[PDB]
Amino acid sequence: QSIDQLIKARGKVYFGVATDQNRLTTGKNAAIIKADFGMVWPENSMQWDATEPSQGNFNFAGADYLVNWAQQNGKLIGAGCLVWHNFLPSWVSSITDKNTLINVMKNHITTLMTRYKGKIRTWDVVGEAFNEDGSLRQNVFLNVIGEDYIPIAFQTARAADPNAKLYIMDYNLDSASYPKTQAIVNRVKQWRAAGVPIDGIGSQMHLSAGQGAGVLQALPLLASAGTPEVSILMLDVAGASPTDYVNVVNACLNVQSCVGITVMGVADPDSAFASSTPLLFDGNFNPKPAYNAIVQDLQ
Numbered sequence: 300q301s302i303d304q305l306i307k308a309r310g311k312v313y314f315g316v317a318t319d320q321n322r323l324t325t326g327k328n329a330a331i332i333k334a335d336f337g338m339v340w341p342e343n344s345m346q347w348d349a350t351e352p353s354q355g356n357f358n359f360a361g362a363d364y365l366v367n368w369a370q371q372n373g374k375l376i377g378a379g380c381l382v383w384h385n386f387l388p389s390w391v392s393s394i395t396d397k398n399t400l401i402n403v404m405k406n407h408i409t410t411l412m413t414r415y416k417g418k419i420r421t422w423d424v425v426g427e428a429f430n431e432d433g434s435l436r437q438n439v440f441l442n443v444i445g446e447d448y449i450p451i452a453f454q455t456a457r458a459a460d461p462n463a464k465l466y467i468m469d470y471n472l473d474s475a476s477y478p479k480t481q482a483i484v485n486r487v488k489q490w491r492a493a494g495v496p497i498d499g500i501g502s503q504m505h506l507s508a509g510q511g512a513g514v515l516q517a518l519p520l521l522a523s524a525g526t527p528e529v530s531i532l533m534l535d536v537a538g539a540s541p542t543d544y545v546n547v548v549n550a551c552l553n554v555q556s557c558v559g560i561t562v563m564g565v566a567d568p569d570s571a572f573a574s575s576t577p578l579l580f581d582g583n584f585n586p587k588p589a590y591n592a593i594v595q596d597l598q
């Protein structure tokens with residue numbers, strides 16, 4: 300059974316997975332993604348390191364592979380991350396001039412989104428912008444531009460492709476009492492009140508065991524920021540217990556603006572946290588109990 304088909308039947312948009320050429324050409328990943336998932340994200344090939352390793356010298360082969368594979372197989376596409384501190388070339392983080400960095404950031408945003416204009420459902424424009432206490436994380440953009448880098452990035456993305464849904468995303472948004480969760484809600488509320496085109500909040504749910512239960516309260520709290528959408532991204536759970544995965548699915552069913560869920564990969568040995576076996580398919584590419592529990596919950 301396909302959890303994408305089943306979650307669509309319940310009124311949601313997709314069940315998705317992060318992947319890339321390295322996985323789509325090995326094992327049973329292509330077959331599983333064709334059968335079970337309705338949306339794909341490039342895990343690495345769209346990041347800044349990969350796409351613009353030298354300023355103005357772009358490298359799109361790997362991202363082109365993913366986009367073309369998705370279109371050929373009828374999958375929705377998410378992509379990112381346009382602006383965050385991860386995968387960031389040192390030629391970007393060493394820039395000290397404000398106007399210089401604004402223009403570099405706008406050009407990176409505009410070039411990537413223009414190349415795939417009309418083909419991308421969701422762009423993660425800004426990622427991991429918050430510290431754990433809810434203050435803004437000090438990356439080169441905050442250091443050099445200031446807090447306006449986030450409005451500027453979304454304004455620029457909206458101008459490049461008005462068809463795409465523009466997300467901010469962060470991790471450790473999984474507990475409704477945690478300071479980082481209420482802070483991103485408070486900030487996104489103000490950005491939207493000021494006309495900034497943030498269409499979504501993406502919760503990067505790299506979860507420890509047992510955290511699924513708290514998502515039932517944290518996800519509606521994120522939705523109270525009033526973005527058109529919220530999404531579950533980078534989902535994995537240490538131990539992969541059905542209890543956690545069913546809790547996460549129930550949370551997205553409970554939140555009307557939650558359009559879908561994206562798991563961080565297909566099979567355990569391809570996880571960056573493989574020793575915690577946190578995904579839905581095992582090392583033989585067979586579905587695990589957590590996969591079956593999601594199927595049964597959605598039926």
Ligand SMILES: N#Cc1ccc2[nH]nnc2c1
Nearest residue numbers: 317379380423532533561
């Ligand atoms: N799942 C997922 C995922 C992985 C990498 C990303 N970069 N930007 N958005 C992303 C979403």
